[PDB]
């Protein structure tokens, strides 16, 4: 529709006439990465700093510090075996495979 309007963007537009100085003091993390890296993650003058951190390596990175909290938290997906205790009776299974024991154990 030839007739310039204005679409419209997004995101503020500071008049933040920048200086340099006087700013907020900081701090740093540097967490260790699988490979070993320490994507040194500085921070504001103060605050919590994690135990790990997903690396710019897209991976993640536990502390650059021998702190060292826990790993656990995972959990299994389904197994088609899980789908077995699902829609199947084991001892049926049990046998069935036992029957097999006959079969290839039969020749």
Query: Residues in the site for another protein, rule: CB under 8 A?
Result: 2-19, 22-24, 26, 29, 41-44, 47-50, 54-58, 78-81, 83-84, 87-88, 90, 93-94, 96-97, 99-100, 103-105
Minimum CB distance to another protein, residue 16 (Å): 5
Q: Which secondary-structure segment (H or E) carries 85?
A: helix 82-87
| Strand ranges (E), 7-104 | 26-28, 32-33, 42-44, 61-62
Minimum CB distance to another protein, residue 69 (Å): 16
Residue number, 20 or 72, with CB nearest to another protein: 20
Minimum CB distance to another protein, residue 24 (Å): 5
C-alpha dihedral sign at 12, 18, 24, 27: positive
Q: Which residues pair with 3 in a beta bridge?
A: none
Distance CA 22, CA 45 (A): 12
Q: State CA 30 to chain mean position distance.
A: 18
Residue number, 72 or 78, with CB nearest to another protein: 78
* 49 touches 39 (CB < 8 A): no
Residue number, 6 or 72, with CB nearest to another protein: 6
Minimum CB distance to another protein, residue 62 (Å): 16
């Amino acid at each position: 529709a030839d007739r310039v309007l204005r679409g419209s963007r997004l995101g503020a537009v500071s008049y933040e006439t920048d200086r340099n100085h006087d700013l907020a003091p900081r701090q740093i993390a540097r967490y260790r990465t699988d490979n070993g890296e320490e994507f040194e993650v500085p921070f504001a003058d103060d605050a919590e700093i994690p135990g790990t951190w997903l690396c710019r390596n897209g991976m993640e990175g536990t502390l650059i510090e021998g702190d060292l909290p826990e790993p656990k938290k995972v959990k299994p997906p389904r197994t088609h075996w899980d789908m077995l205790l699902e829609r199947r009776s084991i001892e049926e299974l049990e046998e069935l495979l036992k029957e097999r024991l006959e079969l290839i154990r039969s020749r």
